[PDB]
Amino acid sequence: GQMFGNGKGSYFITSKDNETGITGIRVFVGPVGLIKSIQVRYGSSWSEKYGIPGGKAHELILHPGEHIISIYGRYRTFLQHVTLITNQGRSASFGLETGKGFFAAPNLTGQVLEGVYGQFWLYGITGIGFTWGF
């Protein structure tokens, strides 16, 4: 909490479900370079496509024991850039690094990414938020 970017349009939310946490993140990026949609992998199950159809699928598949611990991003009208940095030093960058920047980290140390929410509109994601927990 709360939501990064100029959120506009349809609300979405996904989260952990008495399971393992996030083991993967699928980001869809178009030729225009903005974040169109996301899928989140819980255990072995991919969530539904949250956003606008189109673009090319790019993935961060987490290693055993690996978790996303902070997130840097850029935005304008749409979420332009997202880089997911993990607890093992790895970082996966998606999208064109333009606009107003943000940085999301959990308040308490040991907390990792467990879910993401936000808004998508015309071409893609316009607002993005993150839920952290142990």
Contact predicate 131/65, CB 8 Å: no
Q: What is the resolution of this structure in A?
A: 2.6
**Cross-strand partners of 56:** 29
- The C-alpha atoms of residue 18 and residue 98 are separated, in whole angstroms, by 37
Please enumerate, as own/partner, the contacts of 107-111 that have beta carbons within 8 Å and a separation of 24 or more. 107/132, 108/132, 110/134
Sheet containing 79-86: order of strands: 91-95, 79-86, 68-75, 100-104
Distance of alpha carbon 115 from alpha carbon 122, whole angstroms: 23
Method: X-ray
Q: What is the 3-state secondary structure (H, E, C) of 76-124?
A: CCCEEEEEEEECCCCEEEEECCCCEEEEECCCCCCCEEEEEEEEECCCC
Give dist(CA 38, CA 71) in Å, integer. 14
What is the rounded distance in angstroms from the CA atom of residue 111 to the CA atom of residue 21? 11
Residues in the chain followed by a break, C to N above 2.5 angstroms: none
Measured over the CA atoms of residue 109, residue 115, residue 119 and residue 122, the dihedral's sign is positive
For the chain, the 3-state helix, strand and coil shares in percent, each to the nearest 5, are 0, 60, 40
- Can you give the residue ranges of every domain in the chain? 1-134
What is the architecture, at CATH level 2, of domain 1-134? Aligned Prism (2.100)
| Residue indicated by tokens 């839920």 | 131
Cα atoms in the 13 Å half-sphere on the side-chain side of 10: 12
- Tracing tokens 């467990």 back to the chain, one arrives at 114
Rounded Cα distance, 95 and 98, in Å:
9
Which of 130, 124, 27 is CA-nearest to residue 77?
124
- C-alpha distances out from residue 13 to 3, 31, 86, 89, 115, Å: 12, 26, 21, 27, 8
